Amino acid sequence: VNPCCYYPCQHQGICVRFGLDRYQCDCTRTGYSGPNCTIPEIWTWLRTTLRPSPSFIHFLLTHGRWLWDFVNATFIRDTLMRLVLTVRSNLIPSPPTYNIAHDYISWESFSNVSYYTRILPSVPRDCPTPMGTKGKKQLPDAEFLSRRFLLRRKFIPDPQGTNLMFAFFAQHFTHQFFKTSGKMGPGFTKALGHGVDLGHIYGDNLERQYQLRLFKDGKLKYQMLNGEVYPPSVEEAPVLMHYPRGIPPQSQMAVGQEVFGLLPGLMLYATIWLREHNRVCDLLKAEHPTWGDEQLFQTARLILIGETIKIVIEEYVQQLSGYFLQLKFDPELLFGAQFQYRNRIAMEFNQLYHWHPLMPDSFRVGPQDYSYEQFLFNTSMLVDYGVEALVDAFSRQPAGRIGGGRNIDHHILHVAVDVIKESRVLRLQPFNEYRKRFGMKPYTSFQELTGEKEMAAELEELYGDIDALEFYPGLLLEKCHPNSIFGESMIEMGAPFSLKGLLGNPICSPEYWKASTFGGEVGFNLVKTATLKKLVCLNTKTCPYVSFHVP
Amino acid sequence: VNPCCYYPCQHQGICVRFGLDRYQCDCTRTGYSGPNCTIPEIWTWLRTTLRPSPSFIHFLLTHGRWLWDFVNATFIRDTLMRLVLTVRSNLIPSPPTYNIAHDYISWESFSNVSYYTRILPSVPRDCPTPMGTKGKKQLPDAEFLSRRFLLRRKFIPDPQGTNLMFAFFAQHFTHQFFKTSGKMGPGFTKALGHGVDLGHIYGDNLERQYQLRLFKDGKLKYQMLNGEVYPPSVEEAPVLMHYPRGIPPQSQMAVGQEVFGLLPGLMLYATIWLREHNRVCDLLKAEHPTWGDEQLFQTARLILIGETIKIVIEEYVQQLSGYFLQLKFDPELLFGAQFQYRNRIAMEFNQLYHWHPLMPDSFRVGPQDYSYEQFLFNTSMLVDYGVEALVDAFSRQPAGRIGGGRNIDHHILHVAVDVIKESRVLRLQPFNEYRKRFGMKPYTSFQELTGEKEMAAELEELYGDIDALEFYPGLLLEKCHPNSIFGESMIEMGAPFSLKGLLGNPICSPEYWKASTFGGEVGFNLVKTATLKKLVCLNTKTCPYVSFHVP
Numbered sequence A, B: 001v002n003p004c005c006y007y008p009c010q011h012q013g014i015c016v017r018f019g020l021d022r023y024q025c026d027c028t029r030t031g032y033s034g035p036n037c038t039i040p041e042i043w044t045w046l047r048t049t050l051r052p053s054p055s056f057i058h059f060l061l062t063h064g065r066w067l068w069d070f071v072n073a074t075f076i077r078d079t080l081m082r083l084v085l086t087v088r089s090n091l092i093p094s095p096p097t098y099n100i101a102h103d104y105i106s107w108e109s110f111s112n113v114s115y116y117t118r119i120l121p122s123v124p125r126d127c128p129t130p131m132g133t134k135g136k137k138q139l140p141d142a143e144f145l146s147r148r149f150l151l152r153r154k155f156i157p158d159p160q161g162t163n164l165m166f167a168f169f170a171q172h173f174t175h176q177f178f179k180t181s182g183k184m185g186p187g188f189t190k191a192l193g194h195g196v197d198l199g200h201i202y203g204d205n206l207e208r209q210y211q212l213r214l215f216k217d218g219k220l221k222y223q224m225l226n227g228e229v230y231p232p233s234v235e236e237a238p239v240l241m242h243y244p245r246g247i248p249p250q251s252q253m254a255v256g257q258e259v260f261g262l263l264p265g266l267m268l269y270a271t272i273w274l275r276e277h278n279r280v281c282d283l284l285k286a287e288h289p290t291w292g293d294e295q296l297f298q299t300a301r302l303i304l305i306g307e308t309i310k311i312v313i314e315e316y317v318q319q320l321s322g323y324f325l326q327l328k329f330d331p332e333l334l335f336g337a338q339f340q341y342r343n344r345i346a347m348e349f350n351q352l353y354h355w356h357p358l359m360p361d362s363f364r365v366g367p368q369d370y371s372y373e374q375f376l377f378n379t380s381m382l383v384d385y386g387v388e389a390l391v392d393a394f395s396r397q398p399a400g401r402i403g404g405g406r407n408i409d410h411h412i413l414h415v416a417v418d419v420i421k422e423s424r425v426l427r428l429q430p431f432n433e434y435r436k437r438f439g440m441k442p443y444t445s446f447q448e449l450t451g452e453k454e455m456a457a458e459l460e461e462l463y464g465d466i467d468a469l470e471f472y473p474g475l476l477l478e479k480c481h482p483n484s485i486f487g488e489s490m491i492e493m494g495a496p497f498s499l500k501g502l503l504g505n506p507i508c509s510p511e512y513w514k515a516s517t518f519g520g521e522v523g524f525n526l527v528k529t530a531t532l533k534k535l536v537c538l539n540t541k542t543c544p545y546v547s548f549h550v551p
């Protein structure tokens, strides 16, 4: 049997096969020696024997508001954050390593950008069981597993105060670096860019950007409806969109991310940003009468990536954490560090991120309470209500907890079924292996993963071994931290990928982080002071309650 | 007039335009302050007031063989080299900055890999003269300039001992990262990869690699002629090659770099490497009976990139330098440094590298002395003579000096004409600006550039200003160092680009520099001990005189 199915090599050592029955662990620079990379170095030993658990830290960071307030006002705020940035990032390899096709380093992996990368090679196709050595020869029926432990029975709202404004923000921003090529199969992405390139606004390819572009003042095309600015129609900007058969071009808004037409929340955010891009164009032209379309356009886009990167950080990543420590977005905290300004979307990440539980049972817009069947392909709700109305609405309605179990609405429960299935095609390694990869202790029993006995008992008879518990389920069934939206794994695997992904954009490099990159101090400050409220309000007649937190 | 035409901003500060008549220099992190980035910081001041000229250093490194011998045996060899690596590299920006289309940072520049990048933005299209502010409104006729100062009158052999073996090696290796898209125009490359990806062996695209591949044991296809292994025929591997009309497929060797069929030297090296790739496949399979085609193939290619990177360094870059200091290729000297494992071929580099003077007057193969007209599209010379014969020949025949003037053979003198012309389309800045970019003092007169009065006097009446002397001519007409192949500029602009280009390949990163990346200690050592002699000799029945130095 393939010796590597035993996952012999610890601490990131690489299991290389040799001969017909041998294997060797490459423990290069792992901090351990030995046949399985298990004997630590004196420093490695200390470093780990002194690492306070995730739980202990997430305690501190969510406690002592008073003590934090002070720290937040001292330099220690940068000091910490920096550490977060560095430490958090080491967990993610760069340049990238494996892909659906190669469980080894290779020029093709490194250069063929159509593949999502992956942190742990697949479960060798020649192992006894699907997960390697443990568990059953057959894995739990995805469908069943989904109805038993993920089907929302009673809506559990997210304790932290997260609302649909954040929910939809989550979706939007993620679908700019998550874009699986249905034509190529799992493992393949259409979002070459692998990151915050804002391609969900400008298009994932030149042709499409040129379609969406006004080619005047750096402006993006658009249309006026009710005296308000909205994305142009597919008639004006003949771009490919995914609208159900039967809808005319004149009723479809062209936007960049073909999929965005199937949900007002999505098309709401697409409108705020289009508005914002054209707004910045004006600020620029005023300053640089000499510039042309391209430069106004290119510089506009760099300012928006910056805006996006900031909010995504100080307002978006702040909400999730639950932390008191003011997360600062400052590319300079990394200038002294050894960091690689490069990123590549991992498949392990496309899954981890699949937060479908967040969606509510119905969508309340004032006295009106719309059903999924009334929300889903509603070409009229946005123009009808207008930005402000929806922004206030989503900002007020709570979104559901993400971790815990049984909280995904039946309407989209199929998506979770597909996720689990794709996971298997991708041949992802077991959840417990992931725990270790990201520096955590693997679970010893189902009752420790879930904080109980009922589900644990059944997961046990389904999986057989805790060491056979799959990634996604293990991510959504594990116990939540105190009054959290989710827990440990999500937060200890989910952050690295999600931080290295941001601070690794080329604009955060010393080479690009210059006022001139943004057209001068004005563009630069736009970036430096971006904010959710400013983003909405500077682009709307009135300024509604706008937050990632429910009032 | 465009204020930026005056190249106002010093020390890499960025000239941003404002209003109709203003401009601002972005001196961010330049080490200088002031409206033009001219007032240094105390440290910057010291750092430069104490920098011994290029000339003084190139003196030391080419002198004191005895003192060097010792140093070379101490740790100081690494110590220095490391410094070379770091220092040399800072000169080159990463991530990349401008391109033919954008004289500003931009997402498109950063992501559209079809463009060659450039270190200095173009000469604004709205400047008084072609070079900005100085010189004449009309530039010297390329053709004339070429016949007057570059046309080889009497063959000047390269003083250092460089031979055609090195010459052809130079060509081969460079045409893997220099591959201008004739269909797209100047500024565009077909070599996405921008570096040592060995695509001149495997193809610049998947389709073509699959054509060249045996799909057995990781082997590359091939054919036996005279009991010897040679690249397959276009009949066997239906791949696109550039052979003159009238030559049948059965007489064309398919190789990866379409252009390689027009010169035995080129097809000589293509044969040595094909041989080498298949040789390593065997070493691998033996070790890993369990592996398949892909993995043998992928791992083979990583071993060859490594081989290539080493020889290119310790034998190739050693020859050019002329240095006594043993250049060590060790990716680890950089593990402590802040380095970006990323590269992008600059247009400024495609030019700089255009060493056509190297080609001799005739090609001597034993008693036989072939003319260009007998060498150029000679489909039979390689199979006729075989690897060894040619390798001995080229290793024995000296190549001509590269710097100095009037040493390019008439047969290819057109290429220099085109270079100068392309330079102008690309709107490259003046040579003197380049001097400064790469930390050198700009020339004050033509007589200082050339080491004399005759050519200097005429270049002067042609250009008008030394500050209008173009890049390429300035690179090939400047005075050579003592008994050198070329001088200062070439060596102070030509190395950075050429070092950062190597040490920046992903395999040099801590992430990939592991014995497992190469299939174990065996592949790893193959890399670690690669050598020109081993490369040829382990792939030939007999081992001829093989060197980059003439006997």
Ligand code: HEM
Pocket: A167, A168, A170, A171, A172, A174, A175, A178, A179, A180, A263, A350, A351, A353, A354, A355, A356, A358, A359, A412, A414, A415, A418
């Ligand atoms: C109205 C509620 C929502 C619906 C209708 C929905 C539906 C879907 C569907 C259809 C898939 C693709 C897999 C398949 O079923 O074939 C998917 C993928 C995705 N969704 Fe949602 N989703 C919703 C909200 C969100 C939210 C709030 C997030 C959080 C960011 C999210 C994250 C994802 C991710 C990460 C993907 C993977 C993208 C890719 O594979 O390219 N979705 N969603």
Ligand code: HEM
Pocket: B167, B168, B170, B171, B172, B174, B175, B178, B179, B180, B263, B350, B351, B353, B354, B355, B356, B358, B359, B412, B414, B415, B418
């Ligand atoms: C038999 C002698 C040689 C011939 C026939 C030759 C010819 C050419 C020609 C035709 C061009 C393209 C520009 C044009 O004229 O349209 C060129 C480009 C090139 N050659 Fe050579 N060359 C020779 C040797 C070499 C050598 C020894 C080097 C040194 C590496 C070299 C370096 C270059 C470079 C850098 C390019 C640019 C590649 C690109 O634009 O994609 N060539 N050469």
Ligand SMILES: *[C@@H]1O[C@H](CO)[C@@H](O[C@@H]2O[C@H](CO)[C@@H](O)[C@H](O)[C@H]2NC(C)=O)[C@H](O)[C@H]1NC(C)=O
Pocket: A112, A113, A114, A115, A183, A184, A185, B205, B206, B207
């Ligand atoms: C990136 O890798 C994918 C997968 O190898 C390549 O796609 C396949 O390429 C081969 C040869 O062109 C075809 O036979 C397959 O049908 C292709 N598609 C799929 C979905 O496998 C793709 O060509 C590579 N892209 C680049 C730019 O190298």
Ligand SMILES: *[C@@H]1O[C@H](CO)[C@@H](O[C@@H]2O[C@H](CO)[C@@H](O)[C@H](O)[C@H]2NC(C)=O)[C@H](O)[C@H]1NC(C)=O
Pocket: A205, A206, A207, B112, B113, B114, B115, B183, B184, B185
């Ligand atoms: C990279 O940039 C080049 C130049 O912009 C793009 O090529 C041009 O693209 C437009 C739109 O497709 C065409 O009208 C031109 O004819 C294209 N060719 C040239 C030579 O200009 C190219 O499409 C870009 N590539 C990517 C992958 O973005």
Ligand SMILES: COc1ccc2c(c1)c(CC(=O)O)c(C)n2C(=O)c1ccc(I)cc1
Pocket: A084, A088, A316, A317, A320, A321, A322, A323, A327, A352, A353, A354, A490, A491, A494, A495, A496, A497, A498, A499
């Ligand atoms: C320390 O608490 C947290 C909590 C959440 C955090 C982080 C830290 C960090 C980094 C940091 O700021 O620590 C990021 C990137 N997070 C995310 O937003 C995230 C993204 C995707 C997924 I799925 C899960 C979480």
Ligand SMILES: COc1ccc2c(c1)c(CC(=O)O)c(C)n2C(=O)c1ccc(I)cc1
Pocket: B084, B088, B316, B317, B320, B321, B322, B323, B327, B352, B353, B354, B490, B491, B494, B495, B496, B497, B498, B499
């Ligand atoms: C110090 O002397 C030298 C002389 C030549 C050197 C170098 C150093 C370095 C780096 C280093 O080893 O210093 C490289 C990369 N060189 C080149 O081979 C080179 C490449 C292209 C061109 I056009 C010109 C030179």
Ligand SMILES: *[C@@H]1O[C@H](CO)[C@@H](O)[C@H](O)[C@H]1NC(C)=O
Pocket: A006, A007, A008, A034, A035, A036, A038
């Ligand atoms: C290495 O791991 C294998 C597989 O778990 C195990 O059988 C072997 O005993 C281990 N060797 C050591 C020294 O831990």
Ligand SMILES: *[C@@H]1O[C@H](CO)[C@@H](O)[C@H](O)[C@H]1NC(C)=O
Pocket: A373, A374, A375, A378, A379, A380, A381, A382, A384, A385
């Ligand atoms: C779309 O939303 C509007 C509210 O703006 C509602 O009146 C309309 O009925 C919805 N359309 C569908 C098909 O549910």
Ligand SMILES: *[C@@H]1O[C@H](CO)[C@@H](O)[C@H](O)[C@H]1NC(C)=O
Pocket: B006, B007, B008, B034, B035, B036, B038
């Ligand atoms: C800046 O450079 C411009 C153009 O060379 C020059 O006219 C001006 O005097 C300079 N200003 C200073 C303070 O050097």
Ligand SMILES: *[C@@H]1O[C@H](CO)[C@@H](O)[C@H](O)[C@H]1NC(C)=O
Pocket: B373, B374, B375, B378, B379, B380, B381, B382, B384, B385
């Ligand atoms: C090609 O080279 C051979 C020497 O191997 C020579 O005899 C032959 O004439 C050459 N062909 C041409 C067309 O010059």
